[PDB]
Amino acid sequence: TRPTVRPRNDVAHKQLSAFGEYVAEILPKYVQQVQVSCFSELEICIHPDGVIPVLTFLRDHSNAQFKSLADLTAVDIPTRQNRFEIVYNLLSLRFNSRIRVKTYTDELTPVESSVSVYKAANWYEREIWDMFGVFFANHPDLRRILTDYGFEGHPFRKDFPLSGYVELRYDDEVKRVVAEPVELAQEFRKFDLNSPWEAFPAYRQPPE
Amino acid sequence: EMVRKCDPHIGLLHRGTEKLIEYKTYLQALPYFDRLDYVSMMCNEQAYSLAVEKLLNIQPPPRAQWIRVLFGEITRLLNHIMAVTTHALDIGAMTPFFWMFEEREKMFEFYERVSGARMHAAYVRPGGVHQDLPLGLMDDIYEFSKNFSLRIDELEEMLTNNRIWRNRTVDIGVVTAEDALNYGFSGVMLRGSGIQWDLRKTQPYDVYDQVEFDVPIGSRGDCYDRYLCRVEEMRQSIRIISQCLNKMPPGEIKVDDAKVSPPKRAEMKTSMESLIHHFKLYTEGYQVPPGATYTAIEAPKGEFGVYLVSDGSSRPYRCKIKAPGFAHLAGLDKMSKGHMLADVVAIIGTQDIVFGEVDR
Amino acid sequence: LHHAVIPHGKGGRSSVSGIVATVFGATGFLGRYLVNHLGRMGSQVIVPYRCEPYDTMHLRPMGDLGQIIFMDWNGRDKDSIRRAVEHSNVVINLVGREWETKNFDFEDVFVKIPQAIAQVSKEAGVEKFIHISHLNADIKSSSKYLRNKAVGEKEVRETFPEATIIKPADIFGREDRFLNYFANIRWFGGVPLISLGKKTVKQPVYIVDVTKGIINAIKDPDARGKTFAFVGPNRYLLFDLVQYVFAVAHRPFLPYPMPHFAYRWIGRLFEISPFEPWTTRDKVERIHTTDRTLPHLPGLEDLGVQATPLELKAIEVLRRHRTYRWLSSEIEDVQPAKTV
Amino acid sequence: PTVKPPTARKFIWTNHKFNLSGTPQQYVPYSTTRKKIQEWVPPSTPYK
Amino acid sequence: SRGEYVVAKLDDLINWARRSSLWPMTFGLACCAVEMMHMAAPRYDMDRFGVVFRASPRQSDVMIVAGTLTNKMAPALRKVYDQMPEPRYVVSMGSCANGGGYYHYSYSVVRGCDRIVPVDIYVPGCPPTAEALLYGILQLQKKIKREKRLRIWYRR
Amino acid sequence: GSDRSRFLEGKRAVEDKNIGPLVKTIMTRCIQCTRCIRFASEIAGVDDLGTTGRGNDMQVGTYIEKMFMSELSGNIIDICPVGALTSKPYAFTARPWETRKTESIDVMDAVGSNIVVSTRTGEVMRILPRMHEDINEEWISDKTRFAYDGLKRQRLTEPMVRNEKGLLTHTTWEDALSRVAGMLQSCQGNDVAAIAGGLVDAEALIALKDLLNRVDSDTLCTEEVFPTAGAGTDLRSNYLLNTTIAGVEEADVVLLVGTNPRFEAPLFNARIRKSWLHNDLKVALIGSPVD
Amino acid sequence: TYKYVNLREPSMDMKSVTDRAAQTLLWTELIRGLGMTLSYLFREPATINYPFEKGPLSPRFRGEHALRRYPSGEERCIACKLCEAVCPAQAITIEAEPRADGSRRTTRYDIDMTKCIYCGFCQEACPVDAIVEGPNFEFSTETHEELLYNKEKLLNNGDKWEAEIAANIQADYLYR
Amino acid sequence: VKQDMPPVGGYGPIDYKRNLPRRGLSGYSMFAVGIGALLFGYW
Amino acid sequence: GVRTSPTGEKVTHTGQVYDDEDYRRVRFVGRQKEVNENFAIDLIAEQPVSQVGSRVISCDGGGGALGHPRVYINLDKETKTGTCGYCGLQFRQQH
Amino acid sequence: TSVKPIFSRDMNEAKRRVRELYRAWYREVPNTVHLFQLDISVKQGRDKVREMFKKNAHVTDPRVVDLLVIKGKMELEETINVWKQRTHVMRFFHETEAPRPKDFLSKFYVGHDP
Amino acid sequence: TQLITVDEKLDITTLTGVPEEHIKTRKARIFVPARNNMQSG
Numbered sequence A: 001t002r003p004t005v006r007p008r009n010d011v012a013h014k015q016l017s018a019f020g021e022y023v024a025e026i027l028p029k030y031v032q033q034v035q036v037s038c039f040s041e042l043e044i045c046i047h048p049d050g051v052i053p054v055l056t057f058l059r060d061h062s063n064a065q066f067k068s069l070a071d072l073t074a075v076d077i078p079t080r081q082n083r084f085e086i087v088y089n090l091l092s093l094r095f096n097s098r099i100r101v102k103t104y105t106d107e108l109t110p111v112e113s114s115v116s117v118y119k120a121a122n123w124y125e126r127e128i129w130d131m132f133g134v135f136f137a138n139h140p141d142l143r144r145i146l147t148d149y150g151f152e153g154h155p156f157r158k159d160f161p162l163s164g165y166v167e168l169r170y171d172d173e174v175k176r177v178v179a180e181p182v183e184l185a186q187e188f189r190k191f192d193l194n195s196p197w198e199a200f201p202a203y204r205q206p207p208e
Numbered sequence B: 001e002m003v004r005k006c007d008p009h010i011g012l013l014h015r016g017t018e019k020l021i022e023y024k025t026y027l028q029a030l031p032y033f034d035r036l037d038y039v040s041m042m043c044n045e046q047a048y049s050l051a052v053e054k055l056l057n058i059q060p061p062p063r064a065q066w067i068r069v070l071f072g073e074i075t076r077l078l079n080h081i082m083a084v085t086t087h088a089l090d091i092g093a094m095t096p097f098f099w100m101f102e103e104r105e106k107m108f109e110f111y112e113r114v115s116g117a118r119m120h121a122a123y124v125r126p127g128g129v130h131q132d133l134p135l136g137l138m139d140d141i142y143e144f145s146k147n148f149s150l151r152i153d154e155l156e157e158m159l160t161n162n163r164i165w166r167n168r169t170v171d172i173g174v175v176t177a178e179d180a181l182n183y184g185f186s187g188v189m190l191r192g193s194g195i196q197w198d199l200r201k202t203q204p205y206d207v208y209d210q211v212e213f214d215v216p217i218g219s220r221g222d223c224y225d226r227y228l229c230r231v232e233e234m235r236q237s238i239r240i241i242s243q244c245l246n247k248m249p250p251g252e253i254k255v256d257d258a259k260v261s262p263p264k265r266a267e268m269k270t271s272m273e274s275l276i277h278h279f280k281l282y283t284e285g286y287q288v289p290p291g292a293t294y295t296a297i298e299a300p301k302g303e304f305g306v307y308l309v310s311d312g313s314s315r316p317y318r319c320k321i322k323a324p325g326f327a328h329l330a331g332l333d334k335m336s337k338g339h340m341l342a343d344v345v346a347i348i349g350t351q352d353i354v355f356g357e358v359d360r
Numbered sequence C: 001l002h003h004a005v006i007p008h009g010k011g012g013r014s015s016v017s018g019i020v021a022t023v024f025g026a027t028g029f030l031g032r033y034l035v036n037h038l039g040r041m042g043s044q045v046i047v048p049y050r051c052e053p054y055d056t057m058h059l060r061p062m063g064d065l066g067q068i069i070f071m072d073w074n075g076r077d078k079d080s081i082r083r084a085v086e087h088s089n090v091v092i093n094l095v096g097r098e099w100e101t102k103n104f105d106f107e108d109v110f111v112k113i114p115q116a117i118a119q120v121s122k123e124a125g126v127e128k129f130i131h132i133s134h135l136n137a138d139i140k141s142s143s144k145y146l147r148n149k150a151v152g153e154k155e156v157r158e159t160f161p162e163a164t165i166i167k168p169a170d171i172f173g174r175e176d177r178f179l180n181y182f183a184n185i186r187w188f189g190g191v192p193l194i195s196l197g198k199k200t201v202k203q204p205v206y207i208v209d210v211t212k213g214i215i216n217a218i219k220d221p222d223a224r225g226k227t228f229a230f231v232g233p234n235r236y237l238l239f240d241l242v243q244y245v246f247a248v249a250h251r252p253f254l255p256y257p258m259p260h261f262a263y264r265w266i267g268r269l270f271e272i273s274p275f276e277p278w279t280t281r282d283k284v285e286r287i288h289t290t291d292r293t294l295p296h297l298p299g300l301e302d303l304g305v306q307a308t309p310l311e312l313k314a315i316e317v318l319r320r321h322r323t324y325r326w327l328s329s330e331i332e333d334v335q336p337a338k339t340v
Numbered sequence D: 001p002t003v004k005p006p007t008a009r010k011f012i013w014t015n016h017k018f019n020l021s022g023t024p025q026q027y028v029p030y031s032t033t034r035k036k037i038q039e040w041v042p043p044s045t046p047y048k
Numbered sequence E: 001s002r003g004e005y006v007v008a009k010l011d012d013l014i015n016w017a018r019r020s021s022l023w024p025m026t027f028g029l030a031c032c033a034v035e036m037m038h039m040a041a042p043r044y045d046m047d048r049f050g051v052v053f054r055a056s057p058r059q060s061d062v063m064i065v066a067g068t069l070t071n072k073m074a075p076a077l078r079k080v081y082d083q084m085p086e087p088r089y090v091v092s093m094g095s096c097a098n099g100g101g102y103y104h105y106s107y108s109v110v111r112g113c114d115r116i117v118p119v120d121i122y123v124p125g126c127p128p129t130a131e132a133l134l135y136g137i138l139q140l141q142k143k144i145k146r147e148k149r150l151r152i153w154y155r156r
Numbered sequence F: 001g002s003d004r005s006r007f008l009e010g011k012r013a014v015e016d017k018n019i020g021p022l023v024k025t026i027m028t029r030c031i032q033c034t035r036c037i038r039f040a041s042e043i044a045g046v047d048d049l050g051t052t053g054r055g056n057d058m059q060v061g062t063y064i065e066k067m068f069m070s071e072l073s074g075n076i077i078d079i080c081p082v083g084a085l086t087s088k089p090y091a092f093t094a095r096p097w098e099t100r101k102t103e104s105i106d107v108m109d110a111v112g113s114n115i116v117v118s119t120r121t122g123e124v125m126r127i128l129p130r131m132h133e134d135i136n137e138e139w140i141s142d143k144t145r146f147a148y149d150g151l152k153r154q155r156l157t158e159p160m161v162r163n164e165k166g167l168l169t170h171t172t173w174e175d176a177l178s179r180v181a182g183m184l185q186s187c188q189g190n191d192v193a194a195i196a197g198g199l200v201d202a203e204a205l206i207a208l209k210d211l212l213n214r215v216d217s218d219t220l221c222t223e224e225v226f227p228t229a230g231a232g233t234d235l236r237s238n239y240l241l242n243t244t245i246a247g248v249e250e251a252d253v254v255l256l257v258g259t260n261p262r263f264e265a266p267l268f269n270a271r272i273r274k275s276w277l278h279n280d281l282k283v284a285l286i287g288s289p290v291d
Numbered sequence G: 001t002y003k004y005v006n007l008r009e010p011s012m013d014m015k016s017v018t019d020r021a022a023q024t025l026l027w028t029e030l031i032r033g034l035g036m037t038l039s040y041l042f043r044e045p046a047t048i049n050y051p052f053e054k055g056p057l058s059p060r061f062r063g064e065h066a067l068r069r070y071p072s073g074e075e076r077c078i079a080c081k082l083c084e085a086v087c088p089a090q091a092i093t094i095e096a097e098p099r100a101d102g103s104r105r106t107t108r109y110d111i112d113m114t115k116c117i118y119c120g121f122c123q124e125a126c127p128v129d130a131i132v133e134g135p136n137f138e139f140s141t142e143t144h145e146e147l148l149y150n151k152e153k154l155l156n157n158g159d160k161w162e163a164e165i166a167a168n169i170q171a172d173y174l175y176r
Numbered sequence H: 001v002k003q004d005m006p007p008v009g010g011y012g013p014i015d016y017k018r019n020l021p022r023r024g025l026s027g028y029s030m031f032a033v034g035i036g037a038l039l040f041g042y043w
Numbered sequence I: 001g002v003r004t005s006p007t008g009e010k011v012t013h014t015g016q017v018y019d020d021e022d023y024r025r026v027r028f029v030g031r032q033k034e035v036n037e038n039f040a041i042d043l044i045a046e047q048p049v050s051q052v053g054s055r056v057i058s059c060d061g062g063g064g065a066l067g068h069p070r071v072y073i074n075l076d077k078e079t080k081t082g083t084c085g086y087c088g089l090q091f092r093q094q095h
Numbered sequence J: 001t002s003v004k005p006i007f008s009r010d011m012n013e014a015k016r017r018v019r020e021l022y023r024a025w026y027r028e029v030p031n032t033v034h035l036f037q038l039d040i041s042v043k044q045g046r047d048k049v050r051e052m053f054k055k056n057a058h059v060t061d062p063r064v065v066d067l068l069v070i071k072g073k074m075e076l077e078e079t080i081n082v083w084k085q086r087t088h089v090m091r092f093f094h095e096t097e098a099p100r101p102k103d104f105l106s107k108f109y110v111g112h113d114p
Numbered sequence K: 001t002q003l004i005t006v007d008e009k010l011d012i013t014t015l016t017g018v019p020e021e022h023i024k025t026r027k028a029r030i031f032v033p034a035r036n037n038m039q040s041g
């Protein structure tokens, strides 16, 4: 497995396992799962009431010092009853390390904004309002950031189609850029590309 | 003209890239990344390629790694020529714009000779690169790099010692180090503020731990130190390019797994397994094992990350794009407190923003 | 009914509306909004243009790809008209001029050209032909425009039996020469009229209502052979109309009467250059000509088109002429003009 | 190509054309497929 | 006749003055702005063709829509186009400005700027080369050269 | 499998067979898995496919110029894991990744075969089976599989009314429905009646039944004469297949009276053959001695 | 492994203080910048004389699309739809049927040149070298639908540019 | 095999440092030239 | 070998021609219907049938990697020539 | 059934926030007609505000109407500040769109949509 | 307390931005997709 297969880092795997045990037993009030992947990245799956007590911990504890908010992310998975999955990628420049902090919400539950911890989030969760409809309470200036001003809907939700519902054109009658319902000159062709054979037996799920 | 509040309304180039990535395969999602940071094409290719190769549990050959680093440093020369020359254009010196776009034109010719398109190459692919270097390309890269030092020298002659340039950059846009980290700044926006951090040193990828270069660090967090950091990153990019030309290895340029990389056309048209693999790669695509990763590299603007979520199929389930310019343009609101309209333009210059990756 | 002209879609931009229209004179004021309303249904619109193609540029975003076909034609060329109308299932004529020129007088523009267009549309099998006359078309009229237009209306009827002839009274819009004629006479001395312009009665019609009437006549099979008279919902005098025009434009209004003795001579005073004449004696005879009331001809409401009054759209027409000191004003500023 | 001439083929154009757009020799797009649904032509004899 | 010769030479004069003094406005949107800058670069050098940047729309002739027109900047494109004096021209650069491009099926992309502005020249590429953009500008100059403004005016 | 090759030799090339107008046969692709033979012997009951030759020259075929024509002769296109037996009407037109699947019902027989109508850009490309353990287990008849292309010929696209010459002219919906309803208003009782065809859904059937009951017309008819004397259509149990299609898998004596279930309802015959083979069913027939 | 840009304390002897004051009062670096600008004045500029001189290209260059033919007249496209399956913009639309001599050939082969991203995935996915992305790039149009190529325009581009496409593929194909 | 490779002894040296070569007169010489021009103009 | 419809319009190698009553000929009014006058089905008829003495012939279309994938063609049918599925070059065994 | 609120503990505080939002839009509409120099009356804009509020007059969930108040105040923030333009305000008036067929007979005449 | 008790039905139809025509006049279909009978997988 030398030339093609990626060389596994077992030292970082063991160290992230130990630090995941560390974070899991310092904060048992909110930490639900702790997992380390094959390419040695750590996820602390927590409760959405624990946005501030976890992220202020990792930013300020002397063994964590996760000073840089790299990436704040939402993931829409509609098969769950809390469909949206909020992801915090954190960087500790002191310990040369990266951690992930994951939690959940549905359309209606407000997630606690983390601008009192990381001001870097001031736009990102704003984007999560603009794209996913996840409301963030106690946000300073929460509004849209990436879509058009009169845009109705949250685009990156998976029940929202690829093309929207309205499209624009300039209209010479009213001398104005107007929105009609969307019509395509060619339909976006859907490619059913899933092979019917199980590619990975290691990720096999148990049946019902 | 004393600025009281800046509200950057963006989304004027938001095209919904990362929802279009959800409906196309990985090879079809690769040319979206050339169009995010449209002056840093192969750096975004390299970031997405490292993300997919991290999820695939495979690695490139050595030659493809050195090609990735060589053209990533050519890409870094491209981006810092764009940064410095448009920053001097926006302050008012429109001359080294024209002086350095000839050099940038020649590096676009290097892209055209190696991939066939001058800007968006679709070249650094998951599995290495697409196509091997044409003969005599490295000799012309050497002929470029041998002479590019004098071009940096005459740019630095025009602007660095100049007092009009120091009047527009030295007390302008000062960023403290704790507010740099707490705003998610990355790259030169940290390094102008004196923070010792660079992702090619601290979290090393393909063969950057095998090259030797120095990481320029500022002292005052202003536009002038970020200018000097960009110029010295062009210097050290020429240094890495010399080390990559001297230490290029022979061998292949794709990973030799034909269930990831496409087989060669001379053996696709002869072998049956290679034709089946060519068919199923250019129609279905390779199945990525399920899971999420955050792969961040040192793009010439800073930490460029792909948070890639795969669901076992041959298409990404989710592809979040962390751009440096997003957090930098968030920090524009603090950086313009206590300056003027003729300084907010220089702060937009010193935050090297390309709005494709800011807007997706 | 061929399969390519069967109506598909939801009637949007990129649908197939089943209408193939040759709109003669589409580069003008009416043809602009007609191609606007046709191309947003997804109609094949053939635009034969005489002018520079640059003056057709605004016709290009008005429909989907391959829904507008621009082509040259000459007014005295039946070959170009046969080259244009041979594929259409409707031909709408809009060729007109407020003034007569060296090459084309009113007999060429109104009598010869629409008769040639209707003759070629007849012998090429076009189903629907729509002609746009004027409401005051009279053989005994005092103006050459209305006489030649009534003669051309008669000839269009007698060479096309199913011709839908439409009578607008006075069309106003953003690019009209009815409210913009009234609003661009302010620095000339005080808007001269005959008997202060209170002996002539008008009812202007809005161009979107005219366009909706033309297109609902395209889609009505019961409009074949009919003759329509598109008039507004309210009848004004001319004096209180000009009052209301200068009152929406927030302009000083100092009128004075101007009789026959020299107000037909300001025609030959104001076409002395070969440009567009700012006013002409035919326009003088037509501004001071009252709109006739024809109850027997159907109108907008007989096609299901609601006639929009002037008090809703005069602000939209006349905001262009306010200087700066009353640009940002309201529609609730002007007391409306009295009807008759 | 006075030193290395291109390989002669029966189908390569003898006469090179420039950009014909703007002229009546320009490209016009059209579908290259035939009719999909063949309509029923009713019988031309009367039904009596 | 004589007057046909007069208006023909005046048309050639004004078409020469308008094709050899095109002033494009500084208007980029996306990746194609980089290659438009390379069409201004010293290799290709727009400025030798009389083609020089003017920042305001009032003082410019041709609007090169270079990049992706989204739904949020469609009225900004239209008001920039409207605030150009006549004659104004539009060159469409790149696939997204032509027909929606690589982001064609997106919720927030105006599928071509020909939905918004009247487009004269379509320059194809992703991005088109700066040589191809300079080709599109020279074809726009050829389109201005064969305009017949005063000939049609003397014949109308 | 692996990702590359070692076979540096010359491959075999097998002569292509002619087994019908439905099955395009490219026998170089045949991996000799014998699903042809097992399907034709055990389900289709044909016993006319086989393996001639021996070794690497062994060929699946018929050995003669014989045309494989059963009522299930297209299902060998389904089970062939390679492209040796392709669908000749479907052939070269489409490609399965760009096809849209629509799970529909057959109407060609009264078995009710679950099918996939797989289309592409608003045009019906082909008809695949669906699995249903109680109807058509994963098979369909050849009529079901290959009658999709009569659905794009002879079609009625526009309304037609008789003109003054008594010929059908194309008309609108307003004119056609007005000229129907004018005659509809002048009827009552037995003045108006209705014949239902063979392919009409229950929605349109109760639509026309309610429309003729608004005229108070009890006369609505079908083309198929079911006898009404006795219980008639009142009790459902004397016009259904009362046991099930799957009930053949529990039966041990099947008496077939006055029918040819091979062609009237072919997958019911396939279920009778499967019970004949596996449960040792004893089948008798009253009728003409058909195969 | 790191260096400090702008961490030089200026010397404070009378020599260097007088040098900096003469730099302030007599503008040394401004004359240095004017000297560098004057040094670029006297150079041969890098402006090629387009359209008479053309910028340098490689045989890998990705321009206008073209369908090739075999050296027998038979076109190479055998309707396998890999090029529209790999096409990241879905610019390619293919519909086929068996033609009169039973060959698997296309009836519709459309490439929308206003969706196309010119990335050459179709020429590297095509298993018979049928679609290639040729060397022409000066194919600008005055009309939008002239960049909606059907099969006939792509075959005419192939028959137009085959004498160059064959030589580019001949010089390049060993790298593929 | 034939491949784009660097030569045998490697490529030559590639300069990458700051090279601003300190041209011009000193301060005192420039003040002397200027004051001499002043004195000649005054005389 | 392009043939022309009775309406005056050329016919493509597919067979596509607009009917006489179809309005969509108006896109060619004043312009041209671009067809390619080198039909592939007529240029492959002009190729000679290659006589070989083998039982199975291999075809790659000429050029090696510049042609199509190499496929193997059986020539047992003395009636019918073995046409290659990619290039259309048809082969015959001379016995 | 125990969920976490947003601002409103029940329907009464939610209707209070809807009522304050209606007050704010009713104050905003004359300035919206003025500074955008729209071609409609003030009463027509107030009718459109009434229609857009009566569109959502059926919800008995406090979190949903809290989010509707939040989205309405975002619309109001984009209206008071000139962030929307004449086009984004006049998108509420579906003017260029033809009136869709509402009865069964004309929908049957023109298309397949029920 | 920091929680409420919503007794009503979870319904977000006013929040998704979907027009009414693509809410009520559509018919969602919830199904395990049938096996492609070309393939035993």
Ligand SMILES: NC(=O)C1=CN([C@@H]2O[C@H](COP(=O)(O)OP(=O)(O)OC[C@H]3O[C@@H](n4cnc5c(N)ncnc54)[C@H](OP(=O)(O)O)[C@@H]3O)[C@@H](O)[C@H]2O)C=CC1
Pocket (backbone or CB within 6 Å): C024, C025, C026, C027, C028, C029, C030, C031, C049, C050, C051, C075, C093, C094, C095, C096, C097, C098, C104, C109, C132, C133, C134, C135, C168, C169, C170, C171, C177, C178
């Ligand atoms: N107030 C009004 O506008 C009213 C108008 N009408 C009638 O409605 C029609 C449309 O009116 P409107 O658009 O406002 O008028 P315009 O003068 O603005 O438009 C006339 C159109 O016809 C073309 N045209 C004019 N003269 C000739 C000619 N001699 N040969 C060929 N083409 C020619 C023009 O193109 P080009 O640039 O080439 O000249 C233009 O496209 C006319 O027939 C007019 O008489 C009736 C009642 C009221």
Ligand code: SF4
Pocket (backbone or CB within 6 Å): B035, B120, E030, E031, E032, E033, E066, E067, E068, E093, E094, E095, E096, E097, E101, E102, E125, E126, E127, E128
């Ligand atoms: S057409 Fe393509 S390469 Fe060009 S600006 Fe658009 S996204 Fe960028």
Ligand code: SF4
Pocket (backbone or CB within 6 Å): F029, F030, F031, F032, F033, F034, F035, F036, F037, F060, F079, F080, F081, F082, F084, F085
């Ligand atoms: S089913 Fe296919 S592979 Fe199997 S024996 Fe028949 S033809 Fe050969």
Ligand code: SF4
Pocket (backbone or CB within 6 Å): B276, F029, F081, F082, F083, F084
């Ligand atoms: S698709 Fe299957 S049967 Fe067809 S050639 Fe390939 S491996 Fe053989």
Ligand code: SF4
Pocket (backbone or CB within 6 Å): G083, G086, G087, G088, G089, G090, G091, G092, G111, G115, G116, G117, G118, G119, G120, G121, G122, G123, G133
């Ligand atoms: S170059 Fe790319 S975008 Fe263009 S047709 Fe080929 S695969 Fe599609």
Ligand code: SF4
Pocket (backbone or CB within 6 Å): G076, G077, G078, G079, G080, G081, G082, G083, G084, G094, G125, G126, G127, G128, G129, G130, G131
């Ligand atoms: S062009 Fe090539 S890849 Fe595309 S369908 Fe034709 S043969 Fe296949």
Ligand SMILES: [K+]
Pocket (backbone or CB within 6 Å): F076, F077, F078, F079, F080, F081, F082, F083, F084, F085, F086
């Ligand atoms: K098969």
Ligand SMILES: [Zn+2]
Pocket (backbone or CB within 6 Å): I059, I060, I061, I068, I084, I085, I086, I087, I088, I089
């Ligand atoms: Zn061959």
